[PDB]
Design a protein around this nucleic acid. Sequence first.
DNA 1: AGGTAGTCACAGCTGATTGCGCTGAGGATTAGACGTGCGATATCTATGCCA
Length: 52
Amino acid sequence: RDCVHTLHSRDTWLKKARVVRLGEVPYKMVKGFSNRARKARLAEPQLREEND
DNA sequence: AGGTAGTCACAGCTGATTGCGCTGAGGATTAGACGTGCGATATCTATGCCA
């Protein structure tokens, strides 16, 4: 479990008063969902998985 | 006594006025999780088959 870690978006990290370091690799590329993003993904499902 | 400049009484030009339109700030406003229900599915052992 100590090797299992929780993650947040860069915007959510900033909300948590955290700034991602330069060049940091994405620990998890996952589904992205925001108002404009959600509507765009509903427009076409091919990029719903491709957002990451 | 004589005529055109100073003074007063009216005219054109233009700015302020009064209906009415438009932006900028300001205060109102179901998607992964978490489970289970159902269904396909590994799973353990009785016990009598005949060599």
